[PDB]
Ligand binder design. Structure first.
Ligand SMILES: NC(=O)c1ccc[n+]([C@@H]2O[C@H](COP(=O)([O-])OP(=O)(O)OC[C@H]3O[C@@H](n4cnc5c(N)ncnc54)[C@H](O)[C@@H]3O)[C@@H](O)[C@H]2O)c1
Ligand SMILES: NC(=O)c1ccc[n+]([C@@H]2O[C@H](COP(=O)([O-])OP(=O)(O)OC[C@H]3O[C@@H](n4cnc5c(N)ncnc54)[C@H](O)[C@@H]3O)[C@@H](O)[C@H]2O)c1
Ligand SMILES: [Zn+2]
Ligand SMILES: [Zn+2]
Ligand SMILES: [Zn+2]
Ligand SMILES: [Zn+2]
Lengths: 374, 374
């Protein structure tokens, strides 16, 4: 039995930025009260994990990254009431403590117990459960899924369907739910509308999936990598444009295509310039632009306030506006019910050990989602 | 009489930027097809009229500014069906052609026939109806109310209650409807919410009126001129704070005051810094910030997109989001039904002749609204 004892296993540790992960042994302390130790089954490679490697998303190093995954509860600590050993679960990188101001608000989902705004790289109690080479290692967004085992606080774990295919539903841990929720929940795309989606990767395809579900008459995919267009069309994009093909700025191009601006635009890249462009391309009087992309650490964008004064609405969101713990199981349920598909997002599958190759696949632009199996 | 003939009358002409208005005689051509010549009865001095003088709001000079007003139709042109001579009317600086995508949109109001985005300073047909000393003078937002008589396009005029007190209802032409709608229509202030209003002048006090009407439990007024606090509280503010009384940034103070950020914030000054501050002080996960102020010409603001990514909604709005020709008559009716008050905004009432004195009362910080009677 491992319940109550330290577990040695392998994890992909990031020691320095812009360096390959180090698959080596780590010691995982047993779960304290209201914490859960999960045996990871599958984890997806989201761009945000690479953001950590690149310094785009700053969080304390050395760290065990990963935040989009699914596994099986190994053991629970004292007082845990929502999961039991043997349960299939999805780690919530955006917690749902249910007690804070945001959690009790009918709309807000960015729990104040989150570790995304001011990254500490610890458990809710300010400590770590990871030791490598005798050195304490940092957690990432309280999940740290790039490990055969991880310990998370109770508020950062959701029990899902016992019959859920973990190699697929892991995407509901981030990529899918983010893009999908951004369209249907945050921007609230309407029937007959024209949408523009900047960035046709895992999250952007999910946004297209969200707009299609919402009944958008037009969904224009925007990406500088034309190789991304086929997949986009496949999931709902009615047309795709590459900014590099035009002699004029894309927001102008898009404004002409939509005869005056789109109803809903989405920034799913993570650049300051595309954020402004996405805003500029939605109709000046009633257009809505939603930021999904993670910006470079601490950098400020420059924009003219008249873009807003005319009537535009600009907002951003975390995890697609989904109250994590309530939503994740409902989303897995719907997937089981064939309400939406995850297959189109999965382009590569690799064993955990091949984690480094997976990030090269992302970086080459060859992939959308590579799922890592433990 | 005057009908179908050229009328000679007094108007306040701004020949150059940063100059007092020149009260002289001008010639008002008769209305053309679908135009209306209106005899002005009362016009409110709005801060935007001063923006023109200061160059903050660029529009072709020389010109007859003025947009917040009420008058009586003197004669209508061939094809006018909405108003008739003797009708009490209110000119609309944001028209409602009723045929463009925006007017047809359930939530759009910034009509595509507007002259604010790219000021021409002409009638819808590209020409002027004003002549002064043999020289053609520009129109302002298609209204030009600083004249005893003016000619506006039918789409820029609304018929109002015949028993309307024109010297009060003229505020419905701008300041009041703007602030009121911003709060109840655009921001959509919820019952029991905490609001923060930056700028306590005529538009700001109206934002407060709307917030209170919307049920806001807490309404914090913010202004660097403490003299503005008495009236703000009179109209609804629960507390007022002067930024310069604090050693630390006001968004900090407001965040501490609202225990994490306010629900709704409003920028009603016209500064890039207070626009970012306003957004920053509303709760990060579900706060809504509305820009009401007109920023200085051609300047960009700088902000960190994380403010939005966390969940904040940032909007802006022209004329309080009200479809002009539809709402103005409705608002007047409600005023007549004692649904809201206009007297709190009226601090000075001067003759048209004293136009410059009123601008001086505004500039000095002494007035909220000065109504000029012709
Ligand atoms: N808010 C959240 O909760 C949240 C969640 C998931 C992902 N994200 C962020 O969204 C972004 C994308 O995630 P992904 O996994 O879908 O990424 P990805 O790398 O798979 O996709 C980014 C895409 O944008 C394209 N692109 C790059 N520069 C472009 C440009 N200048 N113009 C047009 N297209 C351009 C790339 O070719 C690529 O197809 C990342 O920044 C990620 O951190 C945010
Ligand atoms: N969007 C629209 O349709 C619309 C309509 C009407 C007015 N406006 C704009 O709203 C703004 C305000 O108009 P108003 O008529 O109420 O004018 P106003 O000048 O009477 O009110 C401005 C107030 O803000 C205060 N202020 C200035 N700097 C400040 C600072 N740094 N911090 C805090 N407070 C400060 C002033 O003391 C004053 O009370 C202007 O830019 C005006 O052009 C926009
Ligand atoms: Zn992610
Ligand atoms: Zn919470
Ligand atoms: Zn119109
Ligand atoms: Zn005004």
């Amino acid at each position: 039995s491992t319940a109550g004892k330290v577990i040695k296993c392998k994890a992909a540790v990031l020691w320095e930025e812009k360096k390959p992960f180090s698959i080596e042994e780590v010691e995982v302390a047993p779960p304290k009260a209201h914490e859960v130790r999960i045996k990871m089954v599958a984890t997806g490679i989201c761009r945000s994990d690479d953001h950590v490697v690149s310094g785009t998303l700053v969080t304390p190093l050395p760290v065990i990254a990963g935040h989009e995954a699914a596994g099986i509860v190994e053991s629970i600590g004292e007082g845990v009431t929502t999961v039991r050993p043997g349960d299939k679960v999805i780690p919530l990188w955006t917690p749902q403590c249910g007690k804070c101001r945001v959690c009790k608000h009918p709309e807000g989902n960015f729990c104040l117990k989150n570790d995304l705004s001011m990254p500490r790289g610890t458990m809710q109690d300010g400590t770590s459960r990871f030791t490598c080479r005798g050195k304490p290692i940092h957690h990432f967004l309280g999940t740290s899924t790039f490990s055969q085992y991880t310990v998370v606080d109770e508020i950062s774990v959701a029990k899902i369907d016992a019959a859920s295919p973990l190699e697929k539903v892991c995407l509901i841990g981030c990529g899918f739910s983010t893009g999908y929720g951004s369209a249907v929940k945050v921007a609230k795309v309407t029937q007959g509308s024209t949408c523009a989606v900047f960035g046709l990767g895992g999250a952007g395809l999910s946004v297209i999936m969200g707009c299609k579900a919402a009944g958008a008459a037009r969904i224009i995919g925007v990406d500088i990598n034309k190789d991304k267009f086929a997949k986009a069309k496949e999931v709902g994009a009615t047309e795709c444009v590459n900014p590099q093909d035009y002699k004029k700025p894309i927001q102008e191009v898009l404004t002409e295509m939509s005869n005056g601006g789109v109803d809903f635009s989405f920034e799913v890249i993570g650049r300051l310039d595309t954020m402004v462009t996405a805003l500029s391309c939605c109709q000046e009087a009633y257009g809505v632009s939603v930021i999904v992309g993670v910006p470079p650490d601490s950098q400020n964008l420059s924009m003219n306030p008249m873009l807003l004064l005319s009537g535009r609405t600009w907002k951003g969101a975390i995890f697609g506006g989904f109250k994590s713990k309530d939503s994740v199981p409902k989303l897995v349920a719907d997937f089981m019910a064939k309400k939406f598909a995850l297959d189109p997002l999965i382009t590569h599958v690799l064993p955990f050990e091949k984690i480094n190759e997976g990030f090269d696949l992302l970086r080459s632009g060859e992939s959308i989602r590579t799922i890592l199996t433990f």
